[PDB]
Design a protein around this ligand. Structure first.
Ligand code: C5P
Ligand code: CL
Length: 319
């Protein structure tokens, strides 16, 4: 079956329902058993490197896991288990350097066309139901040329493997201010940073003149309703802004950039766009949320689907 080296992965409740194959615990100090057909690791976490090297030396395929795009109520850093995982047998969605399984699913346009009705339905529920990767934050309350600038957690692997770093956050903020000289600039702090368990790229930024720091945990769709445009490096927020109908400028190379839907500023955007080609928003959504992500039922733990997870999350949110 699938070999697992990381105790953290092994402890994910209902892991075998996400992987849809039996899983077995392996030792880094013993040969890979013959019955193991693939090895699973978590993204590019440092713990992945040695299992990946073993897999390659043993001729076994590598599967990289990560959290789903609609994951849970509370944050991962707070211990809440995931209701959704991505399962990538090629790379990982946030690594722009080569195709990922997600990239290939987006490029399979016929497969995505078959899911247009499901995609439209789920997109509508996510936007109008105010859902996101995490789902405990209250709705934002406003009181209007507003430009949203999205911070991330320092050294997020989606930044590093998306060909970005501190420089792109500085360039992004400078561009937002220079390109919108009369707007209010809202810098949104990431919730893991608000929880105190991480630091953000704008940690040293002084709230100043036209720049307001949004240091509150609020649901993205509710906040996006009040902004005119969104600047990101690689945050999932950028895709959520596309769902909300807002223009998105991208300074890194996230999974949703370079398809023709974003104002891409990264110096390699032309090269990534040549590899990816074009895709529509509904194609990207179907590939990412309906084909790439896998779900369990929040009440039974059995294999499930996005619609059931959305239905349950909106239950919990009505309070
Ligand atoms: N500045 C930010 C960055 C992320 N987020 C939340 O964190 C989720 C994951 O975003 P990242 O990809 O930036 O980690 C988003 O879907 C959103 O719910 C936020 O609310 N404010
Ligand atoms: Cl790992």
């Amino acid at each position: 079956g699938i070999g697992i080296y990381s105790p953290g992965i092994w402890r994910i409740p209902h892991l075998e329902k996400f992987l849809a194959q039996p899983c077995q615990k392996l030792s880094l100090l013993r040969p890979v058993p013959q019955e193991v057909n693939a090895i699973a690791v978590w993204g590019h976490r440092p713990s992945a490197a040695k299992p990946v090297a073993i897999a390659k030396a043993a001729g076994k395929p590598v599967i990289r896991l990560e959290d789903g795009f609609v994951r849970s109520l509370d944050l991962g850093v707070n211990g809440e288990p995931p209701l959704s995982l991505v399962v990538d047998d090629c790379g990982i969605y946030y690594d722009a350097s080569k195709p990922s399984a997600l990239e290939k699913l987006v490029q399979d346009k016929a497969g995505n066309t078959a899911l247009i009705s499901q995609a439209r339905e789920a997109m509508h529920t996510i936007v109008t139901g105010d859902m996101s990767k995490y789902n405990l934050a209250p709705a934002f309350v406003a009181d209007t040329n507003i430009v949203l600038v999205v911070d991330q957690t320092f050294n997020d692997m989606s930044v590093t493997y998306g060909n970005a770093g501190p420089h792109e956050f500085a360039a992004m903020l400078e561009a937002a201010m220079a390109e919108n000289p009369q707007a209010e600039i809202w810098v949104k702090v990431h919730p893991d940073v608000l929880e105190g368990k991480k630091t953000g790229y704008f940690a040293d930024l002084r709230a100043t003149q036209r720049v307001r720091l949004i240091a509150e945990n609020v649901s993205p769709q509710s906040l996006l309703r009040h902004v005119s445009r969104v600047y990101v490096v690689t945050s999932q927020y950028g895709f959520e802004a596309l769902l909300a109908g807002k223009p998105v400028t991208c300074f890194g190379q996230p999974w949703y950039a370079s398809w023709g839907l974003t104002d891409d500023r990264h110096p390699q955007s032309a090269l990534l766009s040549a590899r990816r080609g074009s895709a529509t928003l509904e194609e990207l959504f179907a590939a990412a949320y309906l084909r790439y992500c896998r779900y369990i039922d929040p009440q039974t733990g059995e294999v499930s689907d996005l619609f059931t997870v959305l239905q349950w999350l909106q239950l919990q949110r009505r309070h």
